[PDB]
Amino acid sequence: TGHKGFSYKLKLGKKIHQNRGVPQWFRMKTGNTINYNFKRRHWNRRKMGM
Amino acid sequence: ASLKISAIKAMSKNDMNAKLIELKGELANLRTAKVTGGAPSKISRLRVVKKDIARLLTVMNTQRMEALRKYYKQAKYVPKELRPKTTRKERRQLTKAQLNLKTVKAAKKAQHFPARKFFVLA
Amino acid sequence: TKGTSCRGTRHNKTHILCKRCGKRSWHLQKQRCASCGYPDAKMRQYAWGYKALRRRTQGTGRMRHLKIALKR
Amino acid sequence: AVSNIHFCKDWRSKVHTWFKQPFRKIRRHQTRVEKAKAVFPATIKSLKPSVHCMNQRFNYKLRLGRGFTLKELRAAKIDKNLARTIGIAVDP
Amino acid sequence: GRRTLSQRKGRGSIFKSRSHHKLGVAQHRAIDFFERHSTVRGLVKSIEHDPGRGAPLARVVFRNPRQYGLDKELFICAEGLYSGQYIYCGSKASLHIGNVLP
RNA sequence: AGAUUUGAGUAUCGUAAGAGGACUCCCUUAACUUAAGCAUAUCAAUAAGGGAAGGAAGAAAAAAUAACAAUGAUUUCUUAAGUAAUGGCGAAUGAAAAAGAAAAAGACCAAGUUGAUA
RNA sequence: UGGAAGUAUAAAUCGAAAAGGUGAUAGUAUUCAUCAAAGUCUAAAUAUUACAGGAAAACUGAUAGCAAAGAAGUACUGUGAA
RNA sequence: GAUUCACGCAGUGUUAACGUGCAAAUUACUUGUCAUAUUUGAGUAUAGGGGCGAAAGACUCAUCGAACUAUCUAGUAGCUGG
RNA sequence: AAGGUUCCUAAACAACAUUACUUGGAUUAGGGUGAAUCGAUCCUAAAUUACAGAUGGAAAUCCUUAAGAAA
RNA sequence: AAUAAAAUAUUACUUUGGAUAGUUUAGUUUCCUGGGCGAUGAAGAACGCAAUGAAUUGCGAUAAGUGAUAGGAACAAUAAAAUGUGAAUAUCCAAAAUUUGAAUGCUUGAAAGUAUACUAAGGUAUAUAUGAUAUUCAAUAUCCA
Numbered sequence: 001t002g003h004k005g006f007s008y009k010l011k012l013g014k015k016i017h018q019n020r021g022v023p024q025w026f027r028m029k030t031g032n033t034i035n036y037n038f039k040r041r042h043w044n045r046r047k048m049g050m
Numbered sequence: 051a052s053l054k055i056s057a058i059k060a061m062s063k064n065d066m067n068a069k070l071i072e073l074k075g076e077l078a079n080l081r082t083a084k085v086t087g088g089a090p091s092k093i094s095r096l097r098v099v100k101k102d103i104a105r106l107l108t109v110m111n112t113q114r115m116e117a118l119r120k121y122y123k124q125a126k127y128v129p130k131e132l133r134p135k136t137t138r139k140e141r142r143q144l145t146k147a148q149l150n151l152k153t154v155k156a157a158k159k160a161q162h163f164p165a166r167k168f169f170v171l172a
Numbered sequence: 173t174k175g176t177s178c179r180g181t182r183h184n185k186t187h188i189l190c191k192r193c194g195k196r197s198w199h200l201q202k203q204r205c206a207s208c209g210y211p212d213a214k215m216r217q218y219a220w221g222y223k224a225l226r227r228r229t230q231g232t233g234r235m236r237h238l239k240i241a242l243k244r
Numbered sequence: 245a246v247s248n249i250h251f252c253k254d255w256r257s258k259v260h261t262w263f264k265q266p267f268r269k270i271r272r273h274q275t276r277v278e279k280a281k282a283v284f285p286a287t288i289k290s291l292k293p294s295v296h297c298m299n300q301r302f303n304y305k306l307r308l309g310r311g312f313t314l315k316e317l318r319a320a321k322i323d324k325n326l327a328r329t330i331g332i333a334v335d336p
Numbered sequence: 337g338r339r340t341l342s343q344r345k346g347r348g349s350i351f352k353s354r355s356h357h358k359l360g361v362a363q364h365r366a367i368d369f370f371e372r373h374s375t376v377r378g379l380v381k382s383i384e385h386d387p388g389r390g391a392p393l394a395r396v397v398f399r400n401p402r403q404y405g406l407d408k409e410l411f412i413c414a415e416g417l418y419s420g421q422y423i424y425c426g427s428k429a430s431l432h433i434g435n436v437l438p
Numbered sequence: 439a440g441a442u443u444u445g446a447g448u449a450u451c452g453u454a455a456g457a458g459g460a461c462u463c464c465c466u467u468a469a470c471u472u473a474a475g476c477a478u479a480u481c482a483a484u485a486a487g488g489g490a491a492g493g494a495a496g497a498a499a500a501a502a503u504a505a506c507a508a509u510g511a512u513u514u515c516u517u518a519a520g521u522a523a524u525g526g527c528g529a530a531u532g533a534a535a536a537a538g539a540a541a542a543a544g545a546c547c548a549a550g551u552u553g554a555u556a
Numbered sequence: 557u558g559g560a561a562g563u564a565u566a567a568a569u570c571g572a573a574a575a576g577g578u579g580a581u582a583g584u585a586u587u588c589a590u591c592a593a594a595g596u597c598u599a600a601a602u603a604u605u606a607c608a609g610g611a612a613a614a615c616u617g618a619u620a621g622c623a624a625a626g627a628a629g630u631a632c633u634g635u636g637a638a
Numbered sequence: 639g640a641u642u643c644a645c646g647c648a649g650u651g652u653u654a655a656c657g658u659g660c661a662a663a664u665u666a667c668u669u670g671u672c673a674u675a676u677u678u679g680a681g682u683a684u685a686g687g688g689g690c691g692a693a694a695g696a697c698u699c700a701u702c703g704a705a706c707u708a709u710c711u712a713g714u715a716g717c718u719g720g
Numbered sequence: 721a722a723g724g725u726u727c728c729u730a731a732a733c734a735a736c737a738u739u740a741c742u743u744g745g746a747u748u749a750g751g752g753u754g755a756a757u758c759g760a761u762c763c764u765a766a767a768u769u770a771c772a773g774a775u776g777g778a779a780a781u782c783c784u785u786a787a788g789a790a791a
Numbered sequence: 792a793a794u795a796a797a798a799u800a801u802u803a804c805u806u807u808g809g810a811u812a813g814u815u816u817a818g819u820u821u822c823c824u825g826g827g828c829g830a831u832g833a834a835g836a837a838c839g840c841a842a843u844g845a846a847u848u849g850c851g852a853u854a855a856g857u858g859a860u861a862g863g864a865a866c867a868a869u870a871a872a873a874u875g876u877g878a879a880u881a882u883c884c885a886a887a888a889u890u891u892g893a894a895u896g897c898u899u900g901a902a903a904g905u906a907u908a909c910u911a912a913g914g915u916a917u918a919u920a921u922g923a924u925a926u927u928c929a930a931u932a933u934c935c936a
Binding site: 356 | 765766
Binding site for chain 10: 191232
C-alpha cells in the first residue's frame with residue numbers, strides 16, 4: 001500500500017536489496033561454483049508473502 | 051592499521067579523546083572521499099583509520115575498567131560486572147565449606163573413630 | 173461461483189509477521205501467533221509436530237552466547 | 245504345541261541390548277584397582293559372617309552374610325564402634 | 337444429530353441483545369432516608385422513546401439531598417405524565433399519578 | 439498515654455520465571471488392532487495433551503521376609519518363569535521369597551530430659 | 557493389580573488405642589513367629605537415539621546412506637497449522 | 639414492503655456457444671429484477687457431534703450426510719494385483 | 721485494500737509476452753519518494769486484553785469494576 | 792507386371808539421455824568422556840557491518856573484526872596500504888556487545904511511541920510473585936492509664 005509501517009518498509013527495502021546477482025569479481029575466484037543467485041524473485045513471477 | 055599500541059599507552063586521558071576526536075574527523079572526510087570518486091589510496095586510508103578508532107577505544111575502555119576493578123577490590127557491595135565469572139548454576143550451589151559442614155556430634159565421632167589403616171596376613 | 177470468481181475479493185490480510193518468530197503467523201483478530209505461540213510465554217511445541225521441532229529450536233540459530241559457554 | 249508369546253505389546257521399544265557388556269568389565273575393574281590404590285583395605289570387602297541359607301532346600305549350605313551381631317562381637321571381645329573401622333561389617 | 341436453534345440461543349453469539357441506542361436502566365432511585373422518612377421532588381424534564389420497548393421513558397431530575405448538584409433518574413412513564421410536571425417520591429408522597437409510594 | 443497481635447506501603451540485599459526434556463518422577467479413565475462378529479478383556483502407563491528435575495534421577499535403613507541347620511537398608515544383573523495367579527477361565531495378561539553376583543554406609547528431626555533457662 | 561470374600565490409590569461417611577501391624581480364603585478364640593506405620597536426608601553399583609567432543613565398522617556409495625555429499629529444512633506451495 | 643425504464647445484479651430459456659474451454663462454471667441473445675425483508679466496503683463476533691442456515695443436509699478458503707492438518711499408523715483386510 | 725521498485729533514464733535483446741520485435745510491466749546499471757497546516761500519532765464505537773480475586777487434576781478458564789488498603 | 796520415394800533389417804560414425812565402471816571433505820550404527828544455558832538477560836527472531844557481495848560465513852555502531860597470550864612470513868578474483876619495530880593463524884582470556892525476545896515502567900499490528908527519579912542530549916532504575924532486615928502506617932483486634 002501507499003501507507004505502511006516503519007518496520008514493514010525496512011523489511012520491504014531489504015527484499016529489494018537481496019534481489020541482486022553475483023558480482024563478476026566473485027565469479028572469478030578459484031574453485032567457485034556460485035554463478036547465479038537461486039534466491040531471486042520478480043514482482044510478477046513470485047509473491048514474497050509479506 | 052598504523053597507530054601502534056605503545057603510542058596509545060603513553061598518551062594521557064585527555065590525549066585519548068583529543069586523538070579520538072581528530073581520528074573521527076579524519077574518517078568523516080574519508081567517507082566523503084569514497085563517495086566523490088577519491089583515489090584508491092584514500093580508500094586504503096579509510097580502512098586503516100577504522101582500526102585506529104577501534105584500537106584507541108579498546109585502550110580507553112580497558113584502562114577505565116581495570117581502574118574500576120581496583121576501586122571495588124575491597125568493596126563489600128561489588129557491582130555485578132566486576133564479580134568473578136561463573137555460570138548461573140554456580141552462584142546458586144552451596145559452597146564447599148557449607149557442603150562439608152558436620153554436626154558437633156558427628157564431628158567428634160569422626161575424630162575419635164577414624165578409618166584406621168590395616169591389612170590382613172595371609 | 174465457488175471457484176475462480178470468488179477469489180477476486182481476497183485482499184484482506186489474516187496473518188502478519190510475528191515479533192517473536194518472524195513468520196507471517198500472527199493472527200490479527202485472534203491476537204496470537206499460530207506458529208510460535210505469542211504472548212504465551214512458552215514457545216509452542218508439540219510432540220506430533222516433530223518436523224516443526226527440528227525447524228526452529230536450539231541449534232538452528234546463531235547461539236551468540238551459548239557457543240562460548242559450552243566451549244568453556 | 246499351543247504357543248504363548250507375549251509379543252502383542254510393543255516389544256521393539258522394550259528391547260535392551262548388551263553392547264555395553266564388554267566395556268562394563270573394564271570400567272568396574274578400573275574402579276576396583278583405583279580403590280585399592282587410594283586406600284588399599286577399603287576394597288578389602290569387610291569381613292562378613294558365615295550364615296546359613298533359608299528354607300529346607302538350602303539350609304545345609306553356608307554363605308556369607310552381612311555384618312556380625314552385637315552378641316558375636318561381645319563373644320569375640322571386640323568393640324562395636326572399633327569394628328567398623330578395621331574392616332568388620334556390623335549388622336545390629 | 338445437530339444442536340437445535342434453541343440450544344444455540346443460550347450461547348449468545350448472534351443472539352445478544354441489540355442494546356446500543358437504549359437510553360439506560362429504567363428504575364426507581366436508590367432507597368435512602370429522604371425516601372423513607374420524607375419526600376423528594378422530581379421534575380419531569382422530558383419524555384423519550386427507548387428502542388426495543390413499547391413504553392416511553394421519562395427523564396426525571398431530583399436534587400441531591402446530601403450534596404450539591406443534581407441526580408438524574410430514568411423512570412417508566414405513567415400514562416398521563418407531562419413535561420415540566422413535579423412528582424414526589426417517599427413515604428409521605430400524595431396519591432397522585434406518577435408519585436412513587438411504599 | 440503505654441504494652442502487644444495482625445495486615446499493609448516504601449527502601450536495601452537476594453530468590454522464581456524462559457530454552458532442553460534421549461534417559462528420570464508423576465497426572466489423565468484414547469482409539470485403530472486381537473478376540474476370525476462384538477459389548478468385559480486386549481492394544482495399554484501405550485499415542486497425543488499437562489507438570490517437575492539432574493548429570494544421573496527414583497528408592498533407601500523393615501509395622502520386611504520366612505516357617506529354615508533361618509535371614510536382614512536401597513538399587514541393578516542371572517534364575518525362579520511364561521511358573522503361582524488373573525481371564526466372555528476365551529483371546530490373552532502375568533509376579534515375588536528363597537538362591538547366585540556388581541556395590542556397600544548410615545544418619546537426623548518431633549516426642550522425652552536440663553532449666554538464676556538463650 | 558498376578559493378588560483371587562479385595563494388592564494399591566483416591567473420594568463420601570465414619571473413626572481408634574493403658575499401643576499395635578503382618579503370616580494374601582471371609583469369621584471368632586487361644587497360642588506361636590516376626591516387625592514396631594502414620595516426619596527427613598543419604599554416596600556406590602544402574603539408565604541415556606537431546607546435545608557436544610572422539611574412536612571404530614563383514615554398514616550405504618549419489619534413485620543408495622539422514623529430507624539434506626553445493627548459499628538443505630534451502631528453492632517452491634498454502635491465510636494458516638504445516 | 640404500488641407499476642415500470644436506466645446504472646448495476648441475477649441466472650428463466652435457447653436444454654445456443656464452449657466443453658483437452660476466455661473460464662476447474664465462462665460467453666451471447668432472451669428473461670427476471672433493479673432502495674426500506676434494498677445493495678455494498680472496512681472493523682468486529684460465532685469453530686468441528688462445533689458454528690451458521692427465510693431450511694437446499696445448504697455454507698463453514700475450488701474440501702462437507704461432519705473441514706483442514708499432524709500423530710497413533712507401515713490401522714485391518716477370509717478380498718484384488720505383483 | 722492488495723502488489724513492492726513494477727516508477728524514470730541510459731546501454732543492451734540470450735531467454736519471456738502461442739509470428740517477430742530496434743518495443744516492454746522483460747536483462748543490466750544508476751536516479752527517484754522532502755509536510756507545524758495532508759494522514760498515522762489523539763478519542764472512543766461494536767468488540768478485546770492485563771495485576772489482585774474466583775474456578776480447575778491440569779493446561780488454562782471466568783471477571784473489566786464487580787469481589788481489592790488496587791485503578 | 793514394375794519402381795524403391797516411403798517402410799523394414801544389420802554394422803560403423805555422430806547426435807538426445809545419463810545407465811554402467813572408477814571415486815568420496817557425506818551419512819548410518821555402536822561404544823567412550825562429559826551432559827559445562829538464563830534477570831550478570833538465555834534459546835529464538837530481526838536489522839546492520841567487507842575496497843569492490845546477492846546468498847552463505849564471521850561479527851555488533853570498536854562491525855568478515857579490537858587488546859593480550861602463543862605464532863613465526865603471508866594474502867590473492869583484481870587493485871591498494873601495512874608488515875621480522877612482527878603478516879596470516881589459534882584462544883575456556885580482556886574490552887565491546889544494535890532492535891527484540893522469559894522480556895520485566897507503560898503501549899505495541901506491520902507501532903510511529905512514552906511517564907517519573909537519579910546521574911539540553913546520553914546512560915541507569917521503576918513488571919508480578921516472593922524471603923530477610925529497616926522504616927512509615929492501619930485496625931479499640933487483646934489489654935490498659
